[PDB]
From a paper:
In this study, we structurally characterize the interaction of the broadest and most potent MPER-targeting antibody, 10E8, with viral membrane lipids and scaffolded MPER and propose how 10E8 approaches the MPER-viral membrane epitope during neutralization. The membrane proximal external region (MPER) of Env is one of its most conserved regions and, hence, the focus of vaccine and therapeutic design efforts. To aid in characterization of the complete 10E8 epitope consisting of MPER and lipids, we designed an epitope-scaffold that presented the MPER on a stable framework in the 10E8-bound conformation derived from previous crystal structures.
Overall, mutants 1 to 3 were constructed to coat the presumed membrane-interacting surface of 10E8 with different amounts of negative charge to investigate binding affinity and specificity of the 10E8 epitope (protein and lipid) and to examine the effects of the mutations on neutralization potency. X-ray structures of mutants 1–3 and 5 were determined in complex with the T117v2 scaffold at 1.6 Å (mutant 1) and 2.0–2.2 Å (mutants 2, 3 and 5) resolution. Thus, the mutations mainly result in different charge distributions on the light-chain surface, with the most negative surface observed for mutant 3. However, in mutant 3, with the same mutation (R29E(L)), a phosphate from the crystallization condition occupies the site suggesting that replacement of Arg29(L) with a negative charge might still retain binding to at least a phosphate, which is a component of phospholipid head groups (n.b. glycerol was absent from the buffers used with crystallization of mutant 3, and thus does not compete for phosphate binding to this site). Increasing the amount of negatively charged residues on the light-chain surface in mutant 3 results in loss of neutralization of most of the viruses that we tested with the breadth dropping to 34%. Substantial loss of neutralization occurred when the lipid-binding site was disrupted (mutant 5) or when the light-chain surface patch contained mainly acidic residues (mutant 3). In contrast, mutants 2, 3 and 5 each eluted as a single peak with a molecular weight of approximately 150 kDa.
Residue numbers in the entry:
A (entry chain H): 1 to 52, 52A, 52B, 52C, 53 to 82, 82A, 82B, 82C, ...
B (entry chain O): 11 to 24, 26 to 103, 106 to 159
C (entry chain L): 2 to 9, 11 to 95, 95A, 95B, 95C, 96 to 210
The structure:
C-alpha cells in the first residue's frame, strides 16, 4: 500500500505555533487532493481542512474552528504536505492525520460538488497544547521472571516512568526483537505525568547469553534511553 | 473559467466511435485547452468506463478523461447524422446522437457541468431542437446557460 | 458541521447489525464510512452509491434514504468490534466535509478469557533513586472489565494506586495495568505486597517481597 508519514507533533504552549509535515509516496502526489484530520484524546474524528490540486489552483478549505489560524500548503517537488498552526489552544490538542482524498460524483443521483472520501491515511502525529513543562522519563528495568509465563519462557520489561507529554516509543534491541513484545497503554497519574510499561517474553535459556535492551525515545524532551535488562 | 467557442460545435457524417472523439478533440487542441494527445486518453477511458447515456428520445454520450490532461476548461458539442452506438455507462449498447465532450480540469466545474447536462438531456423539448437547429442556433441557446 | 450517530450499538457474534448516520446534507450527498480501532489509522469501508474498496469484506454494505445513511454488517465477527465513522458534506453543495461522532460496535457472545497477571517488584535502580513502583500487568482477558486491589501484607492499600481503563489488544482481547507508588521505606517495612485481579467472579492474586 501507499505510505503517509506525519511528523512535527509535540508540546506547544497555548498561543504558540507549530508546523506539521506529511511525507507521501506510492501514488501521484502532484495530482492528489490531501486532507488533514484530527482526533482529540478520547473523541471522534474531526475534519480540519483540504488542499486541492492544480486544476482547482491549489485552493484550500478549512473547518470553521481553525479558519484564519491554520494554513495548509504543499511542496510537490518533494511530495510534502504541511499544516501550519498559529494561536494554538488546548482544544487543538490531539492526533493529526493526513489522508489521500478521493472525489466522487454519481451522475444520475449526485449533487455538486459531490463527495470527498479518504482512501489512505497516515498513522498521525500527536499535538499537545499545554502550559505544563516537558519532563523526560526515568526508565527502570523489570528483571526477568518465568512465574507467569509459558513453560521455558521468561518475561522481562522496562518501566517508563513520569513523562510529559505523550508519546514515548519503545522498541527492543533496536527493532531486532519484535515477537513477544507487549507495550501497554500509558497511565495518566494524578500528578499529570504519564507512565507505561513494555514487556517481552523470551526463551528462558536465552537469559544467560543474549542481551536485552529496551530503547525508549521521548521526542518532546529530546531524550533517548537504552536500558539493559538483566537477571535478576 | 468556462470557454466554449463557436467552432466547438459541429455535425458529423454517417463515423466511428473513435473518429467522433478526434473530430471533437481537434478544436480543443487548436487553442491549447488540452494536451497534444487528448483524444488518445479520452478514447482509452471510454473502453473501460463507457459514457453512453440511455435517454429518450436522443441518445447522449459524455466522453472525457482525467482532469490532469486538461489545461483550460472547455466543452465540445457534436450532433451525429446517424446514431452511433456507445457502450452503456452502467454496464448494461446505447444509440447516441448528441455528444458532450468535456475537457474540464476543475472538479467543482466538472460536477457543475454534469449537473447541468443531466437537467438538459431530461428536457425532451430542447433535445429535439438540437437535432434540427444549426451550428449557430445550437451555439446560441447553449451559450446563454451559466 | 453535524452528521449524527448513536454512541454505541451491540450485536451477537454472527448476527446482522446496522449503524446509522443522519444529517441534512445526506438528502443530497452520499456518505462514506470508516472503521477505526485504537492506535490504528482509519480504514475506508464504503463510499458513494455502492462502492466497496477491494480489500473490504463482502459483509460490509451501505445504503441511503432521505436524511439517513446506513452501514450494515451482515454477520459480525470479533474483528468487527470497533468505532465506525460516517463522513459527508457539512451542508448541501458545500465544499467542506465533516465526520459523525462515531458509533461503538461491540460484538457480544465472544468467548470468555481469563486474565494473565504479571507483578514486578521495584528495581534496585529505582530504590537508589529513592522511589518505588510496583507494576501489575494484566493481559489477554475478555470481556474488558476487571477490578484491581492491592494489599500490603494482608491490609488493603488505595493510596498511590493508579490503574488504566482496559484497552483492546490487536488480538481482540483486553489489557490493563496498575501501578502502586511507595517509598523505599514502605516497600522495605512490609513482608509482602500483593496485586489482586478480579474478572467475572474469579480472582488471580500475585505476591512479591523485598527479596
Amino acid at each position: 500500500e501507499v505510505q503517509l508519514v506525519e511528523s512535527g507533533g509535540g508540546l506547544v504552549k497555548p498561543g504558540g505555533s507549530l508546523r506539521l509535515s506529511c511525507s507521501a509516496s506510492g501514488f501521484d502526489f502532484d495530482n492528489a487532493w490531501m486532507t488533514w484530520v484530527r482526533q482529540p484524546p478520547g473523541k471522534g474524528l474531526e475534519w480540519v481542512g483540504r488542499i486541492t490540486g492544480p486544476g482547482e489552483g491549489w485552493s484550500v478549505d478549512y473547518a470553521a474552528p481553525v479558519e484564519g489560524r491554520f494554513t495548509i500548503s504543499r511542496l510537490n517537488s518533494i511530495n510534502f504536505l504541511y499544516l501550519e498552526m498559529n494561536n494554538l489552544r488546548m482544544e487543538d490538542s490531539g492526533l493529526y492525520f493526513c489522508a489521500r482524498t478521493g472525489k466522487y460524483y454519481d451522475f444520475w443521483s449526485g449533487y455538486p460538488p459531490g463527495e470527498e472520501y479518504f482512501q489512505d491515511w497516515g498513522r498521525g502525529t500527536l499535538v499537545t497544547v499545554s502550559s505544563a513543562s516537558t519532563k523526560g522519563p526515568s526508565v527502570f528495568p523489570l528483571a526477568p521472571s518465568s512465574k507467569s509465563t509459558s513453560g521455558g519462557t521468561a518475561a522481562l520489561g522496562c518501566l517508563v516512568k513520569d513523562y510529559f507529554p505523550e508519546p514515548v516509543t519503545v522498541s527492543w534491541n533496536s527493532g531486532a526483537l519484535t515477537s513477544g513484545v507487549h507495550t501497554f497503554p500509558a497511565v495518566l497519574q494524578s500528578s499529570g505525568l504519564y507512565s507505561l510499561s513494555s514487556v517481552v517474553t523470551v526463551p528462558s535459556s536465552s537469559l544467560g547469553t543474549q542481551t536485552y535492551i529496551c530503547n525508549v525515545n521521548h521526542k518532546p524532551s529530546n531524550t533517548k534511553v537504552d536500558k539493559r535488562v538483566e537477571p535478576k | 473559467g468556462i470557454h466554449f467557442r463557436r467552432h466547438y460545435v459541429r455535425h458529423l457524417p454517417k463515423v466511428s466511435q473513435n473518429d467522433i472523439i478526434k473530430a471533437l478533440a481537434s478544436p480543443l487542441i487548436n487553442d491549447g485547452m488540452v494536451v497534444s494527445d487528448f483524444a488518445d486518453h479520452v478514447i482509452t477511458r471510454e473502453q473501460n468506463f463507457p459514457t453512453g447515456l440511455p435517454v429518450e428520445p436522443v441518445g447522449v454520450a459524455i466522453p472525457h478523461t482525467d482532469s490532469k490532461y486538461v489545461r483550460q476548461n472547455a466543452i465540445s458539442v457534436g450532433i451525429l447524422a446517424e446514431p452511433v452506438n456507445f457502450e452503456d455507462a452502467g454496464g448494461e449498447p446505447v444509440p447516441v446522437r448528441v455528444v458532450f465532450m468535456l475537457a474540464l480540469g476543475n472538479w467543482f466545474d466538472i460536477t457543475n457541468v454534469l449537473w447541468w447536462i443531466k437537467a438538459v438531456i431530461q428536457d425532451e423539448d430542447f433535445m429535439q431542437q438540437l437535432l434540427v437547429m444549426n451550428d449557430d442556433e445550437i451555439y446560441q441557446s447553449i451559450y446563454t446557460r451559466i | 458541521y453535524e452528521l449524527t450517530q448513536e454512541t454505541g450499538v451491540s450485536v451477537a457474534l454472527g448476527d446482522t447489525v446496522t449503524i446509522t448516520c443522519e444529517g441534512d446534507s445526506l438528502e443530497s450527498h452520499y456518505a462514506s464510512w470508516y472503521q477505526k480501532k485504537p492506535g490504528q489509522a482509519p480504514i475506508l469501508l464504503f463510499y458513494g452509491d455502492d462502492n466497496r474498496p477491494s480489500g473490504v469484506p463482502d459483509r460490509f454494505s451501505g445504503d441511503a434514504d432521505g436524511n439517513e445513511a446506513s452501514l450494515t454488517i451482515d454477520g459480525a465477527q470479533a474483528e468487527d468490534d470497533a468505532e465506525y465513522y460516517c463522513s459527508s458534506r457539512d451542508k448541501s453543495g458545500s465544499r467542506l466535509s465533516v465526520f459523525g461522532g462515531g458509533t461503538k460496535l461491540t460484538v457480544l457472545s465472544q468467548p470468555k478469557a481469563a486474565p494473565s497477571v504479571t507483578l514486578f517488584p521495584p528495581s534496585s535502580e529505582e530504590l537508589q533513586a529513592n522511589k518505588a513502583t510496583l507494576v501489575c500487568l494484566i493481559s489477554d482477558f475478555y470481556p474488558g472489565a476487571v477490578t484491581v486491589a492491592w494489599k500490603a501484607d494482608s491490609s488493603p492499600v488505595k493510596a498511590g494506586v493508579e490503574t488504566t481503563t482496559p484497552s483492546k489488544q490487536s488480538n481482540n482481547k483486553y489489557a490493563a495495568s496498575s501501578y502502586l507508588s511507595l517509598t523505599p521505606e514502605q516497600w522495605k517495612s512490609h513482608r509482602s505486597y500483593s496485586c489482586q485481579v478480579t474478572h467475572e467472579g474469579s480472582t488471580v492474586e500475585k505476591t512479591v517481597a523485598p527479596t
